[PDB]
Amino acid sequence: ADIYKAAVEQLTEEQKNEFKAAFDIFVLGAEDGSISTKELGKVMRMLGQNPTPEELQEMIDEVDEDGSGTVDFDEFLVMMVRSMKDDS
Ligand SMILES: [Ca+2]
């Protein structure tokens, strides 16, 4: 339980702040006060990444459990935690 959550807790103030901060900045007019695979994209490449529009939907579809493809202040710190071991 709480597999990625325990990881988002070991993050650094530079990561938690950049997340919520970049989120609100990218949530401006977002689909629903959040950043779904369609909004997180431009928000992910800015954190130091460059995935594709195809793996994006599948990425959340794996961590998400509602079938919405949205990532508010929660699935963002979780989906980014898996990318830490997906490239290592
Ligand atoms: Ca979701």
> Is 78 within 8 Å of 5 (Cβ atoms)?
yes
Q: Is 66 annotated as a binding residue?
A: yes
Tokens 């529009």 sit on residue: 53
Residue 14 Cα to ligand 1 middle (Å): 24
C-alpha–C-alpha distance, residues 67 and 48, integer Å: 26
**What single-letter DSSP state applies at residue 48?**
T
Domains of the chain: 1-88 (1.10.238.10)
C-alpha to C-alpha distances, 56 to 37, 50, 86, nearest whole angstrom? 6, 10, 14
- The technique is NMR
Radius of gyration of the chain measured on its C-alpha atoms? 12
Residue 78 Cα to ligand 1 middle (Å): 11
Amino acid at 42: K
- Three-class DSSP category at 34: coil
Q: Is 58 annotated as a binding residue?
A: no
Assigned token pair, 54: 């195809």
> Is 36 within 8 Å of 71 (Cβ atoms)?
yes
Amino acid at 74: D
Q: Is 70 annotated as a binding residue?
A: yes
Task: Provide the residues around ligand 1 (an ion) whose CB is within 5 A.
Answer: 64, 68, 70
